[PDB]
Amino acid sequence: NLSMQTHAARMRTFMYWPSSVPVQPEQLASAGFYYVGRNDDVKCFCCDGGLRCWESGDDPWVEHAKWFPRCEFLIRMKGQEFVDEIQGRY
Amino acid sequence: ATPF
Ligand SMILES: [Zn+2]
Are A40 and A18 in contact (CB under 8 A)? Predict the structure, then answer.
């Protein structure tokens, strides 16, 4: 979504993020994700990948590379080498 | 996390 292209815009969507979820808005927004307003469902502004069921210790960048490795925002921020590693390529 |  076009209005979620900035980190600050994505941070504003976490207004009603449930406080019990063990991952923080700053981590999520940095990795491209904004809150869609249901449970702990987030989506990437670039690739539209959705992630939910966040667990203690999850790193949103690693999860983004695990499930949505072709995302261009992810590749530009973290690099193809990182994404390849998370996909089991060295 | 899990994808959708
Ligand atoms: Zn993405």
Answer: yes
* β-bridge mates for residue A43, sequence order: A34, A50
> How many domains are there within chain A?
1
Structure tokens that stand for A39 in this block: 């449970």
The range of the structural domain enclosing residue A72 comes to 1-90
Resolution, rounded to a tenth of an Å?
1.5
Q: Within chain A, what is the greatest distance between any pair of CA atoms?
A: 40
Q: Chain B contact for A39, CB < 8 A?
A: no
Measured distance CA(A66)–CA(A15) in Å, rounded? 27
Q: Mutating which of A52, A61, A70, A86 best tests the B interface, going by the most B Cβ atoms within 10 A? A: A52
Q: How was this structure determined?
A: X-ray
Whole-angstrom distance between the N-terminal and C-terminal Cα of chain B?
A: 10
